mmCIF file of N, CA and C in Angstrom:
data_model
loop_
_atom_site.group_PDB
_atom_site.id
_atom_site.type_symbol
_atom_site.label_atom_id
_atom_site.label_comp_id
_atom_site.label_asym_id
_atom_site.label_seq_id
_atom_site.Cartn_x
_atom_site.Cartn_y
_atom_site.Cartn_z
ATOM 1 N N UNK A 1 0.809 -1.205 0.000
ATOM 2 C CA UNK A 1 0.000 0.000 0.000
ATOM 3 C C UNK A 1 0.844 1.258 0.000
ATOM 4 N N UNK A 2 2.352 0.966 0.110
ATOM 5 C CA UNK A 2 3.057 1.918 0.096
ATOM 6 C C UNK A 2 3.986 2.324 -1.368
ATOM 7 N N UNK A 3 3.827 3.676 -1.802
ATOM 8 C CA UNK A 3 4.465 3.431 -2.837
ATOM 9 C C UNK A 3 5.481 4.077 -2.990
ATOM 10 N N UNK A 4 6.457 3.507 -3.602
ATOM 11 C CA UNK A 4 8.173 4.487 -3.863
ATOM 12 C C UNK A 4 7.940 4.285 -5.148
ATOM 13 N N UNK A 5 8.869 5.044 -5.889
ATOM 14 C CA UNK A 5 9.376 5.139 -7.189
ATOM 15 C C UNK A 5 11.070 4.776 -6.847
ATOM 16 N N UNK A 6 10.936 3.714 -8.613
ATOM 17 C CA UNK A 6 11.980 3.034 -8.942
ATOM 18 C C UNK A 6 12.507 3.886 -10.203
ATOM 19 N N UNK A 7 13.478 4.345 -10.251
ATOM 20 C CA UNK A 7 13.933 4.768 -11.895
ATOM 21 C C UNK A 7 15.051 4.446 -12.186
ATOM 22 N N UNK A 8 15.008 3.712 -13.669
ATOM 23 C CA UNK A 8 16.173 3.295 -14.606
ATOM 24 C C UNK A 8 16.407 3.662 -15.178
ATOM 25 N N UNK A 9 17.217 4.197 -15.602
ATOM 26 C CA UNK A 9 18.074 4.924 -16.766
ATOM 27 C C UNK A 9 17.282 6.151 -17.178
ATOM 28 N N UNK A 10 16.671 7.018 -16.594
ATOM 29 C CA UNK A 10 15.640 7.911 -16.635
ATOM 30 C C UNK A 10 14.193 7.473 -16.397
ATOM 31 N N UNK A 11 14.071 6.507 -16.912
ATOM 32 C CA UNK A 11 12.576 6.366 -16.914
ATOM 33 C C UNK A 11 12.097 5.468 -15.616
ATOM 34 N N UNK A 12 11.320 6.228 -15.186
ATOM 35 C CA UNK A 12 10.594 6.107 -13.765
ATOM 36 C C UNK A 12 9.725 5.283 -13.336
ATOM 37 N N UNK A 13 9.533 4.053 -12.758
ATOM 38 C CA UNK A 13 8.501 2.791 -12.060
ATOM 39 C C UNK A 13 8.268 3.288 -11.340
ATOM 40 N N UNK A 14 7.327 3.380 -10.916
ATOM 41 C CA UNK A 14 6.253 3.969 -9.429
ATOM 42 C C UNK A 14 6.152 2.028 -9.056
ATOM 43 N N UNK A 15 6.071 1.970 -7.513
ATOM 44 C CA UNK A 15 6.144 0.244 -7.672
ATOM 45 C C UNK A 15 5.495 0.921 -5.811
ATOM 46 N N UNK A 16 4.468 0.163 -5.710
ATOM 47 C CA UNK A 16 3.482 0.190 -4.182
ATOM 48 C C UNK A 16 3.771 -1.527 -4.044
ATOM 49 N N UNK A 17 4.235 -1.172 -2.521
ATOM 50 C CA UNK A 17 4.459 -2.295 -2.068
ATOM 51 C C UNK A 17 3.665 -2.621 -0.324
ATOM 52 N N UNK A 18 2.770 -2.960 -0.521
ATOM 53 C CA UNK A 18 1.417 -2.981 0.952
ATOM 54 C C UNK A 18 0.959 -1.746 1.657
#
């Protein structure tokens, strides 16, 4: 339910994790 952002090589994953 919690969410961080992941980013690779510029481009950005938003990734919620409980």
């Amino acid at each position: 339910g919690f969410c961080r952002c992941l980013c690779r090589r510029g481009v950005c994953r938003c990734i919620c994790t409980r």
